Scaffold this active site. Structure first.
Site, PDB file in Angstrom:
ATOM      1  N   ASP A   1       0.866  -1.181   0.000  1.00  0.00           N
ATOM      2  CA  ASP A   1       0.000   0.000   0.000  1.00  0.00           C
ATOM      3  C   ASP A   1       0.909   1.239   0.000  1.00  0.00           C
ATOM      4  OD1 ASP A   1      -3.037   0.840   0.493  1.00  0.00           O
ATOM      5  OD2 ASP A   1      -1.779   2.061   1.905  1.00  0.00           O
TER       6      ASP A   1
ATOM      7  N   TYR B   1      -1.702  11.085   2.216  1.00  0.00           N
ATOM      8  CA  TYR B   1      -2.575  11.250   1.085  1.00  0.00           C
ATOM      9  C   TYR B   1      -2.708  12.707   0.667  1.00  0.00           C
ATOM     10  CZ  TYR B   1      -4.623   6.510   0.996  1.00  0.00           C
ATOM     11  OH  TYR B   1      -4.837   5.171   0.762  1.00  0.00           O
TER      12      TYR B   1
ATOM     13  N   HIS C   1      -7.211  -6.687   0.096  1.00  0.00           N
ATOM     14  CA  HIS C   1      -6.234  -5.620   0.242  1.00  0.00           C
ATOM     15  C   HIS C   1      -5.219  -5.814   1.387  1.00  0.00           C
ATOM     16  CE1 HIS C   1      -4.411  -1.697   0.454  1.00  0.00           C
ATOM     17  NE2 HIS C   1      -4.609  -1.753   1.759  1.00  0.00           N
TER      18      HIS C   1
HETATM   19  N1  LIG Z   1      -8.681   2.947   3.962  1.00  0.00           N
HETATM   20  C1  LIG Z   1      -8.941   1.913   3.487  1.00  0.00           C
HETATM   21  C2  LIG Z   1      -9.253   0.693   2.794  1.00  0.00           C
HETATM   22  C3  LIG Z   1     -10.323  -0.104   3.169  1.00  0.00           C
HETATM   23  C4  LIG Z   1     -10.573  -1.275   2.480  1.00  0.00           C
HETATM   24  C5  LIG Z   1      -9.720  -1.573   1.443  1.00  0.00           C
HETATM   25  N2  LIG Z   1      -8.674  -0.819   1.065  1.00  0.00           N
HETATM   26  C6  LIG Z   1      -8.427   0.317   1.744  1.00  0.00           C
HETATM   27  N3  LIG Z   1      -7.337   1.199   1.425  1.00  0.00           N
HETATM   28  C7  LIG Z   1      -6.323   1.317   2.459  1.00  0.00           C
HETATM   29  C8  LIG Z   1      -5.567   2.581   2.131  1.00  0.00           C
HETATM   30  N4  LIG Z   1      -4.912   2.529   0.809  1.00  0.00           N
HETATM   31  C9  LIG Z   1      -5.844   2.223  -0.265  1.00  0.00           C
HETATM   32  C10 LIG Z   1      -6.773   1.053   0.086  1.00  0.00           C
END
Ligand SMILES: N#Cc1cccnc1N1CCNCC1
Ligand SMILES: N#Cc1cccnc1N1CCNCC1
Ligand SMILES: [Mg+2]
Ligand SMILES: [Mg+2]
Lengths: 546, 546
Positions: free
Chosen positions: A334, A465, A523
């Protein structure tokens, strides 16, 4: 009734047993059957071997004594030992041959999980050979899984002397009938039986586990595949480096070997690497799992620009400088994923190899303002929601438990879509007050996260961000370069934000890019599919960073 | 008037310069004189090399461009390049050939010591070669000694463009006439001169330093031999491991490579290793400099038995376990010295190699009570004084500054003899209220010590001396063993407590024991003779632990 389980090392927790190489060596060299075991056992309670097992002498002192014994044994059996017969050799080879018996370890683990006190009770020696590190590693890998390790050479007593079983019971704080004791050697079980311990004579593993299963009433055989070892935060070495006056970085550190710097995503923690930390250390690396700036025990200055990629990268460089590391392998997920690609482009001399989980490398577009790029992808809508300082902080901090319980979900459980978040007015507007617990995380684990985010909340994390333009400008400086150092991209089938297809052009910028792919993985990669992640990183480390 | 000094890397801080290998290669291969420099410089401000120096392209991208240039240069000069002519090869070789020019570094150091702001200003490149680590190490070793490192490829500008000199002045926060700038390339000096900077054209080092000496009025040439690099506590990575519920150990950590665990003596600190920490890291080791139990930021439980050798050793073992280290090299001094010998005897599988400064290994005498042994040596009298809890604590804590200023003295300065301490009523009864400062230590350094001892005082440290019997009993268990792992004993000529002659039988217990000896060195070895200590440890590490 049974509350404790005790395992031997040689022939129970590790295989082949070394006495076994006495037998095999006899056969291999066509020596009188038992000649080597006679020499090994010569003098019994006053012989060299007992003194070794008692810690009176070290292994290297013992070796020439066993030589003499073998000479004596062969003289009396009216035979000759081979030219170049070498106890050092036989033992070096046997000791490196022995490996952990995984199903026995796994049974011990399971028993410890249902609340048994587990122990290793072993006749072993003080090992001072040039090659001793091999045994040191095995004992390290084993001892961590047990409440006690009792070593004959440290306590001055040996199986089958009855005093060691008394010492055992006393260390366990259990009565003999609460104990199962497993051993490959019958004589060694006897005194346990005399005290009324349940004993198992271990010949083949599977039969021993069947006996162990019956007698404890816990399933041990044919059990589903366990998770990798996790980390208990308060057993970690915790490290702190001040990289500039208001900024100190925390990390957790395990293992030796090439340095591997793990960079977590939003809104996470070093603890997000808890399944990879022991596995990579075990695999021969020096793991440094960061709290990235913004999080946990690292500093969290409030200003937005403190979190642009440039400052963040320079800071990671300084972190290596202060630790005296000329390079590290950078692995990220991420946001940490994006950061390691930039480390690769701006500081290749400092990056041994680079890998990202989920986060693709995508060059800045010098023709399109980042904001526009972002508005052209409905699933990035959540990023516009993060722009306004305060807004997302208020929602995220309102109920920490609920936040992580709503975010940390496997692909088949989700409550929040990242879709039309602005319009809805927030990330959780349509999720429950008290979400159920993901299969990926225990309540204890959520609370660790909750506790870390009580120190700084979400301002620092959200600032990551908030430098779209500033990152874009810096990234444009890198549009002529390619990434030519070793590089791995790991896509996650069911990450609906960082989708696999977003990574599809990466070979244009990174021509020798290597890949892995994980099916049925949302994720939260490291905790969703920890086994696959470990397997994919270690294989890649071993071949590209080693 | 001059307040700042700026140095180039290639040809000023590191030698041979790389442009130099263009010239040498031409000669070696009998190519047209200058052919390689023409190819290197082709296109000038728009050529491949300028883009490289600006960070637009990485080194590996540049390599084939320089190839093309060389082909073009040789076509127009109507000559052929050799079979297997290889820019990669030429550059790999040149880049590893270049080493730090020690006298230039030392002049920069000295100038920084009299308060100059120092900087490196260099035209350099983003290095992504398989062999890039070599340059990463050099820059690491260099950058630490300077206030700023300005790299053409990071700032997007190059010498001789005038904007980089403006960027320079601006980073220095100085006006041009406060600056001396040194460079091997005349064109690069010009814009500095235009701004009214003092410039030095560096051909041979010594002449450049003569010019630099005249113009700054500071002695730089023929200066006495400097101390090794010291550590600034707040630039260290600080590490913490909980080894059991009430006990956490602190250490400072620098470098990569085999782990080397430094164990200080009474009443000292990790900081006692401040001269060895950078040297051993620089020499390719992973240094872990402990605060031993009792001290500094490590825990200091009050109970006496918390400090017997046995508990202390087991704890050090746990410390390795929690860091995931199967072994470390153990190096100790004074009490730490005694502790590492015991690590060697009780945990050889965990000790890669063992070395002691000053502290000899002497087996326990199973026939003589330790107290008696101690009363038979007038210079150990100070140990009886330490026995009574409270007594020595009150004297040592009364005036921390005075304590360390009285203890830390070179062999030719001493105020306290260790002789008839009980009779006199104390350690300092006949020393001044305000001792003078030893040559071994600055006032800043004493105050670091003072501050560390404000956390726990002297109870924990003194307890190390309060387990004579308990250590004796445990040591008796080891009377059959020998130390057969790699081992170094370093004696100190003028330590009047741990005298050289006390080590004279050690070969009986440690047959392959290696030795070093330092003349004119008191008890505080590491800070008395830091240069000799570093030299003796690195030579021994390199040959016995590597
Ligand atoms: N917040 C968040 C989130 C929630 C669910 C799936 N993905 C997520 N995000 C995490 C931050 N980076 C991009 C993806
Ligand atoms: N105190 C002390 C002391 C003072 C001067 C010289 N040596 C000393 N000691 C340090 C402790 N270990 C034995 C030697
Ligand atoms: Mg056995
Ligand atoms: Mg130059």
């Amino acid at each position: 009734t049974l509350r404790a389980a005790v395992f031997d090392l040689d022939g129970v927790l590790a295989l082949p047993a070394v006495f076994g190489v006495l037998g095999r060596t006899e056969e291999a060299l066509a020596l009188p059957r038992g000649l080597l075991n006679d020499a090994f056992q010569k003098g019994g309670p006053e012989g060299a071997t007992t003194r070794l097992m008692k810690g009176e002498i070290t292994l290297s002192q013992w070796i020439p004594l066993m030589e003499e014994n073998c000479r004596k044994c062969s003289e009396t059996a009216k035979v000759c030992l081979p030219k170049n017969f070498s106890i050092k050799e036989i033992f070096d080879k046997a000791i490196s041959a022995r490996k952990i018996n995984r199903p026995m370890l796994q049974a011990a683990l399971m028993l410890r999980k249902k609340g048994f006190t587990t122990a290793i009770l072993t006749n072993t020696w003080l090992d001072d050979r040039a090659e001793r590190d091999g045994l040191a590693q095995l004992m390290c890998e084993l001892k961590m899984h047990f409440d006690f390790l009792i070593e004959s050479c440290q306590v001055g007593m040996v199986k089958p002397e009855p005093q060691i079983y008394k010492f055992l019971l006393d260390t366990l704080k259990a009565s003999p009938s609460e104990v199962v004791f497993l051993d490959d050697i019958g004589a060694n079980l006897k005194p346990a039986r005399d005290l009324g311990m349940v004993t198992i004579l271990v010949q083949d593993t599977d039969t021993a586990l069947k006996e162990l299963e019956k007698v404890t009433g816990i399933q041990l055989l044919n059990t589903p595949a366990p998770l990798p070892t996790s980390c208990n935060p308060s057993d970690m070495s915790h490290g702190y480096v001040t990289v500039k006056p208001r900024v100190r970085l925390h990390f957790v550190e395990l293992g030796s070997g090439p340095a591997v710097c793990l960079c977590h995503g939003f809104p996470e923690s070093w603890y997000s690497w808890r399944y990879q930390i022991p596995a990579l250390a075990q695999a021969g690396y020096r793991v440094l799992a960061m709290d990235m700036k913004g999080y946990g025990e690292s500093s969290a200055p409030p200003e937005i620009e403190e979190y642009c990629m440039e400052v963040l990268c320079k800071e990671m460089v300084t972190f290596l400088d202060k630790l005296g590391l000329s390079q590290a392998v950078f692995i990220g997920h991420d946001w940490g994923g994006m950061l390691v690609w930039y480390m690769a482009l701006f500081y290749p001399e400092r990056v041994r190899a680079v890998a990202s989980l989920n986060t693709p490398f995508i060059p800045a577009n010098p023709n399109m303002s980042p904001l526009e790029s972002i508005k052209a992808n409905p699933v990035f809508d959540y990023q516009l929601y993060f722009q306004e300082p305060g807004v997302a902080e208020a929602e995220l901090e309102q109920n920490l438990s609920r936040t992580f319980k709503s975010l940390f979900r496997a692909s088949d459980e989700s409550v929040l879509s990242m879709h039309k978040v602005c319009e809805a007015g927030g990330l959780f507007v349509n999720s429950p007050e008290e979400p159920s617990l993901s299969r990926m995380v225990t309540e204890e684990e959520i609370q660790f996260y909750v506790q870390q985010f009580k120190k700084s909340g979400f301002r620092g994390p959200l600032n990551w961000y908030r430098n779209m333009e500033r990152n874009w400008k810096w990234a444009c400086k890198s549009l002529g370069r390619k990434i030519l150092i070793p590089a791995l991209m790991v896509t996650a089938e069911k990450d609906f934000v960082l989708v696999p297809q977003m990574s599809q052009h990466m070979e244009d910028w990174i021509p020798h890019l290597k890949r892995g792919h994980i099916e049925d993985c949302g994720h939260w990669t490291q905790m969703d599919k920890p086994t696959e992640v470990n397997q994919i990183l270690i294989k890649w480390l071993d071949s590209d960073a080693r």
